[PDB]
Every structure is written in structure tokens, then in C-alpha cells.
Design an enzyme around this catalytic site. Structure first.
Site, PDB file in Angstrom:
ATOM      1  N   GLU A  19      10.745   3.011  -2.542  1.00  0.00           N
ATOM      2  CA  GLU A  19      10.843   2.589  -1.131  1.00  0.00           C
ATOM      3  C   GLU A  19      11.983   3.076  -0.314  1.00  0.00           C
ATOM      4  OE1 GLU A  19       9.091  -1.233  -1.436  1.00  0.00           O
ATOM      5  OE2 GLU A  19       7.069  -0.558  -0.969  1.00  0.00           O
ATOM      6  N   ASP A 204      -2.617   2.313  -0.994  1.00  0.00           N
ATOM      7  CA  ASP A 204      -3.883   1.664  -1.765  1.00  0.00           C
ATOM      8  C   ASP A 204      -4.768   1.035  -0.513  1.00  0.00           C
ATOM      9  OD1 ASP A 204      -3.454  -1.152  -2.129  1.00  0.00           O
ATOM     10  OD2 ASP A 204      -1.717  -0.263  -2.661  1.00  0.00           O
TER      11      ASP A 204
HETATM   12  C1  LIG Z   1       4.547  -3.724  -7.522  1.00  0.00           C
HETATM   13  S1  LIG Z   1       4.003  -5.110  -6.393  1.00  0.00           S
HETATM   14  C2  LIG Z   1       3.703  -3.992  -5.200  1.00  0.00           C
HETATM   15  C3  LIG Z   1       4.793  -3.752  -4.107  1.00  0.00           C
HETATM   16  C4  LIG Z   1       4.502  -2.980  -3.012  1.00  0.00           C
HETATM   17  N1  LIG Z   1       4.238  -3.547  -1.874  1.00  0.00           N
HETATM   18  C5  LIG Z   1       3.098  -3.203  -0.994  1.00  0.00           C
HETATM   19  C6  LIG Z   1       1.797  -3.242  -1.436  1.00  0.00           C
HETATM   20  C7  LIG Z   1       1.217  -1.998  -1.565  1.00  0.00           C
HETATM   21  N2  LIG Z   1      -0.301  -2.502  -1.824  1.00  0.00           N
HETATM   22  C8  LIG Z   1      -0.262  -3.740  -1.858  1.00  0.00           C
HETATM   23  C9  LIG Z   1      -1.294  -4.744  -2.129  1.00  0.00           C
HETATM   24  N3  LIG Z   1      -2.420  -4.094  -2.496  1.00  0.00           N
HETATM   25  N4  LIG Z   1      -1.046  -5.833  -2.162  1.00  0.00           N
HETATM   26  C10 LIG Z   1       0.148  -6.650  -1.771  1.00  0.00           C
HETATM   27  N5  LIG Z   1       0.901  -5.624  -1.660  1.00  0.00           N
HETATM   28  C11 LIG Z   1       0.971  -4.135  -1.589  1.00  0.00           C
HETATM   29  C12 LIG Z   1       4.502  -4.947  -2.114  1.00  0.00           C
HETATM   30  C13 LIG Z   1       5.336  -5.045  -3.375  1.00  0.00           C
HETATM   31  O1  LIG Z   1       6.820  -4.769  -3.222  1.00  0.00           O
END
Ligand SMILES: CSC[C@H]1CN(Cc2c[nH]c3c(N)ncnc23)C[C@@H]1O
Ligand SMILES: CSC[C@H]1CN(Cc2c[nH]c3c(N)ncnc23)C[C@@H]1O
Ligand SMILES: [Cl-]
Ligand SMILES: [Cl-]
EC number: 3.2.2.9
Lengths: 237, 231
Positions: A19, A204
Site C-alpha cells: 500500500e 474486494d
Molecule cells: C492481509 S489482511 C488485509 C489487509 C488489507 N486491508 C484492507 C481490506 C481490504 N479488504 C478487506 C476486507 N475484506 N476485510 C478487512 N480489511 C480489508 C486491511 C489489512 O491491512
């Protein structure tokens, strides 16, 4: 947002290296502090002084980082950037989400009559700065992007459909997106009276295939969030 | 030689605060830090506020401003191990988040990416707390303490913890956060807390009645442990 007779310094927080890497690359006169497992990059982004923090994932990692950034760089504003799970019905991968408010979706002290999501000693949600929201929406219009503005909810869970998603949709039917850091950063900012705003991009839609979508589209989200953040920093200076 | 102590609520820290001689106070980032000597030992006592982020913010501030050599997290806790009654002591050998879930990418339940699945407490601090328990002749359990941002009150929230963490001895809302921050700065950490309730359908009533008892016992433990570590 900035006191007269000074330049503003913008704090930018991202959770994952993915990011922050594009932004990191664009910083001129870059120096790095490695502190408490977090990394901070200082210098200029297109002539404006920035302090970019890679915090790591989740609420505690983000609180720790935000605290460090404030103590060591004393930025005038913080922008939280990165990817997000899109909850709002019209969202697609790459769309922008701007916070008007943030709330914890996994905080529950309702046994003592606090509102669902509210921690004692805190407001039920944290309102983002009006001037930063207005600035971001101007950026969205000029860049001609698709965006939504609304409540962003944070927890320590990657939302992947089923009962995790249905819980959020029940408790926060108007939440536009979900992630894992933003409310923690807002909480820290609240305690220091620092203007805050979330500008993320959808990787997503938080459903049963959100892990597949994230693994394919994090890069798209990083690119769109980056464009927004670079544009916003310029508009703010 | 400087010992950091963190509690979430004023009720948890008030007895210790009153005992500090030559006391000074700093209010910052919404937290309060008290400095001085506790029975002739230099301490820094933090009142953090409730929950993971408040505790992470507080612990970070304590470290950067006071630089303690060790951190002890004190206060109350929900008892999970069946032998526990109100007022008994729990000491962490380990802490884990019971509400962290990134299992869609194959992390262990409770583990956040970039972290160990759980944080081990300092073995010397544990040994020292166990000697205080012995000398004070207190009832105590040593084991896994789990943290989340929920006050556990029976029903499905309790059932989930018991399913994911069958050997957890107690639940609270700050300890793992503090462990996390300490892990990042290589600061030795232990949790010494006392039971206020058993995290069941009545835990809110038990808490409202027995918080003071738990503050009393945790405070006694912390005082003893500080003297032991320093003297
Ligand atoms: C590898 S853990 C995912 C990372 C990406 N971030 C945002 C995110 C995108 N989709 C999400 C979702 N479906 N549920 C919660 N968070 C997010 C939060 C975390 O740092
Ligand atoms: C007013 S919120 C409760 C405060 C006291 N802390 C420990 C605790 C005791 N019993 C607990 C339980 N049943 N579930 C979770 N935590 C605890 C957590 C918080 O600071
Ligand atoms: Cl809502
Ligand atoms: Cl277990």
C-alpha cells in the site's frame, strides 16, 4: 488546517508495504526512521513535506504507528490510505472510498449499555475532518473517479462473507467499506486533536471470494489510492 | 531501575497512584502518567483507558517518555479456567487476541500478519510473580490470557473463545495490545491481574460488585512484585 506563516506537513499511513511502496518511491530527499517495527519515510512529495508511515496490519499496529508518527513528525493532518473491502452496493474494485466517520465493528461493551461498536471513553464513532473530506471530493471530481463517501468500519478481521459479513451488515447497514486500521488511527487522532481522513480504494467486496479478489486486485487499489493521495496532498498544500 | 505499570481504568490504578511518593502527573494523548517512587522504587504508572487501541497508544507513550525497563499490566479480568473464583490472581505466560481473524489467508486463528500467533511473557517476570503468590499465599493460575474489544458476557461470545482457546485461563481487553507494543520494542512484559467475574451471563453484575476486590488483590500483587524486582 495549518497555522498561518507555516508550511503544512501531511501524515500518510498505510498498513502494508504494497500500500505504501508507490508513494515511497515518489518522495524526494527521502530519509527513513525504523522505529518499534514501523518504518517512516520523510521528505517531499511534489514539493510538500510528508511523513509516510508503514504501520503493519491491524488495530494495535496502526495505533502504535500513528502514535509514533505524531510524536516524531508532528504532522498537521493524517491521511489513511490503502485498500478496503467494499460494502456499499455500487462499489467495484478500484473505486475510491472517503470516510465521513469511522467505527469499530468488533467492539462490544453493550453489557454496560454502551452503543454497539463503542468503547468506553470514546464517542460511538469518530467524525472525519470536514475540510479534508471536501478536499478529497474535489480531487475525485477533477480526476473523474468513481467514489462513495460514508462510514468506514474497522476490526481485526479480514471479512470473507458468511457470518462475519452478515454481522457487520446487521450492525452497520450504512457502512460503505471495511478494513483493519482506520478507526484505530482515527481514535489516536481524536486523542491528539489531529485532523484525519480515510482515502482508500476497493480491492474486494468482502464476500466469500474476497481473498481471491484481494490477491488479484490489491495492486489496482494501491494504484488508485496512490493517485488520490498524491492529488490530495497537492490540493492541501 | 524503572518499572512501568499500566492499568486501563482509574479504578484499577487508583490504589497504586495514591501510594506513589513524590508523585508527578503528565496528561497526554488522553492518558495520564504518574511518576515517583512506590515503596522506594522508581515507577511510571499509566492509566490508558479501555480497549486494545487505548492500551496500545498508552503503552507507546509510556515507552517513549519514561523508558521503563519492564512493564507489568495490572487490573481486573474475566476468569475462564474453572478453578478461578473472584479475587484470585492470573499471571500471563502468554497473550493472544481472541478476535483477530485473518484465517482466509491461512494465518492461525488470533494471529495478525507480521506478528507471532501469540506473545510469550517474560520468564523471569513470571517466576518473580509466582514467588509473590507463594509468599502472599494467594490462589492463582498461570496461563494463556486472551484479549479482544468485547466485554465477555456469556452466550455466543464466550462460546467462541472457549472453542478457539480451550486452555485460556482469563479474558480481558488490553493485555495482548500491551504485549504487542512491548514485543516491538523488546521490552519485558507480564500481566498480573485479578478476577472480577467469570465472563458468563451475569459477568456485568459480578463486575459491578467485585471490581474493587479485584483492584485490591491485583494492587497487592503488583506492590509485592515491584519490591521483589527492585530489592
Ligand atoms: C492481509 S489482511 C488485509 C489487509 C488489507 N486491508 C484492507 C481490506 C481490504 N479488504 C478487506 C476486507 N475484506 N476485510 C478487512 N480489511 C480489508 C486491511 C489489512 O491491512
Ligand atoms: C468496563 S469494560 C471492562 C474493563 C475491565 N477489563 C477486564 C475484564 C474483566 N472482566 C472482563 C470480561 N468479562 N470480559 C472482558 N474483559 C474483562 C477490560 C476493561 O478494561
Ligand atoms: Cl450504519
Ligand atoms: Cl488454548
Amino acid at each position: 488546517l495549518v497555522p498561518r506563516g507555516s508550511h503544512m506537513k501531511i501524515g500518510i499511513i498505510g498498513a502494508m508495504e504494497e500500500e505504501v511502496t508507490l508513494l515511497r518511491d515518489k518522495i524526494d530527499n527521502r530519509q527513513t526512521i525504523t522505529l518499534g517495527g514501523c518504518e517512516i519515510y520523510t521528505g517531499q512529495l511534489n514539493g510538500t513535506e510528508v511523513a509516510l508511515l508503514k504501520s503493519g496490519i491491524g488495530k494495535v499496529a496502526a495505533a502504535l504507528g500513528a502514535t509514533l508518527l505524531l510524536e516524531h513528525c508532528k504532522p498537521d493532518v493524517i491521511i489513511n490510505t490503502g485498500s478496503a473491502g467494499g460494502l456499499a452496493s455500487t462499489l467495484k474494485v478500484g473505486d475510491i472510498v472517503v470516510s465521513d466517520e469511522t467505527r469499530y465493528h468488533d467492539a462490544d461493551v453493550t453489557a454496560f449499555g454502551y452503543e454497539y461498536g463503542q468503547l468506553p471513553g470514546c464517542p460511538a464513532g469518530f467524525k472525519a475532518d470536514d475540510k479534508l473530506i471536501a478536499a478529497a471530493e474535489s480531487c475525485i471530481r477533477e480526476l473523474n473517479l468513481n467514489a462513495v463517501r460514508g462510514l468506514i468500519v474497522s476490526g481485526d478481521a479480514f471479512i470473507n462473507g458468511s457470518v462475519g459479513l452478515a454481522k457487520i451488515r446487521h450492525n452497520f447497514p450504512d457502512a460503505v467499506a471495511v478494513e483493519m486500521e482506520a478507526t484505530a488511527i482515527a481514535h489516536v487522532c481524536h486523542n491528539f486533536n489531529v485532523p484525519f481522513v480515510v482515502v482508500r480504494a476497493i480491492s474486494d467486496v468482502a464476500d466469500q471470494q474476497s481473498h481471491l479478489s484481494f490477491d488479484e486486485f490489491l495492486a489496482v487499489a494501491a494504484k488508485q489510492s496512490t493517485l488520490m493521495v498524491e492529488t490530495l496532498v497537492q490540493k492541501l498544500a
